[PDB]
Write a protein that binds this ligand. Structure first.
Ligand SMILES: Nc1nc2c(ncn2[C@@H]2O[C@H](COP(=O)(O)OP(=O)(O)NP(=O)(O)O)[C@@H](O)[C@H]2O)c(=O)[nH]1
Ligand SMILES: [Mg+2]
Length: 166
């Protein structure tokens, strides 16, 4: 078994914590702790390869960049969570990547861009725009929904692929 430190990122309400709680507890946060260091780790099998998945759930921009260096430096990969309905996410998701290149000290970093909230009926950022970043960054683009729970794990699994490749 291998330990995969999955460092999740988010502007706050993009669904970062929603994807984690789903991939771990599998449910919609109705009264869970408001952001904490109590990271989680689930055991799965990537293409017939049993390995551990330690998904770290950080805070949503609550003044703690100092710790961001401790996690990012210890994270095997990064997952960019953006809301198709919230254009704000697409904004922070851009600068967010720049933070990784700094810590990792290299443009080549294993990460994935997921589009949470793919169930809502009021999307602002079309797949085209979301693809621009994934195509410009050279990373995969997956769509999921914490509410309906569609291809949720599909987004996480993709991360393991990027890492393994590197
Ligand atoms: N409609 C819809 N809402 C979602 C979906 N996923 C998450 N949400 C909701 O959108 C909001 C996102 O913020 P929240 O759940 O508080 O997570 P958070 O903001 O990261 N917590 P915090 O800010 O304390 O770190 C919550 O109400 C969350 O339940 C989704 O797929 N569809
Ligand atoms: Mg949160």
């Amino acid at each position: 078994m291998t330990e995969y430190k999955l460092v999740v990122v988010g502007a706050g309400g993009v669904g970062k914590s929603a994807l984690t709680i789903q991939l771990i507890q599998n449910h919609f946060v109705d009264e869970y702790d408001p952001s904490i260091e109590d990271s989680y780790r689930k055991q799965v099998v990537i293409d017939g390869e049993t390995c551990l998945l330690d998904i770290l759930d950080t805070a949503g921009q609550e003044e703690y960049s100092a710790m961001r260096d401790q996690y990012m430096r210890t994270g095997e990969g990064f997952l960019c969570v953006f809301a198709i309905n919230n254009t704000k996410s697409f904004e922070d998701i851009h600068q967010y990547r720049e933070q990784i290149k700094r810590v990792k000290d290299s443009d080549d970093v294993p990460m994935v861009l997921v589009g949470n909230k793919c169930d809502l009926a009021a999307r602002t950022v079309e797949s085209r725009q979301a693809q621009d970043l994934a195509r410009s960054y050279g990373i995969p683009y997956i769509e999921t929904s914490a509410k309906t729970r569609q291809g949720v794990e599909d987004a996480f699994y993709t991360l393991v692929r990027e890492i393994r490749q590197h």
